[PDB]
Ligand binder design. Sequence first.
Ligand code: NA
Length: 116
Amino acid sequence: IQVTQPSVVLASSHGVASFPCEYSPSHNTDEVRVTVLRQTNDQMTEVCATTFTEKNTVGFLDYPFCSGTFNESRVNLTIQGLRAVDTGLYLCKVELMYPPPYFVGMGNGTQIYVID
Ligand code: NA
């Protein structure tokens, strides 16, 4: 599977950034685990993760600072609570959890600029 996302996003004055993560090939019947990772000058750290299905389309309910809805071939992500120090590259990881066989893909990352 191939994962794509926009190259850059400017966060709002309220520290909110939204962007889509798309994967392919896709079917409406897929079950997918989506993780958002952050990269700065070093390792990629996990920000939030959720699992979506055909029926379970509203994700990240257990993270106050991530939201996401699953619509066909893409997840529409929103990250909140951002501060200037949070400027960095935000990568989508998409795992196809059902049906088998398993696949995992990484997006190229969306650079999020946050100005205080
Ligand atoms: Na949330």
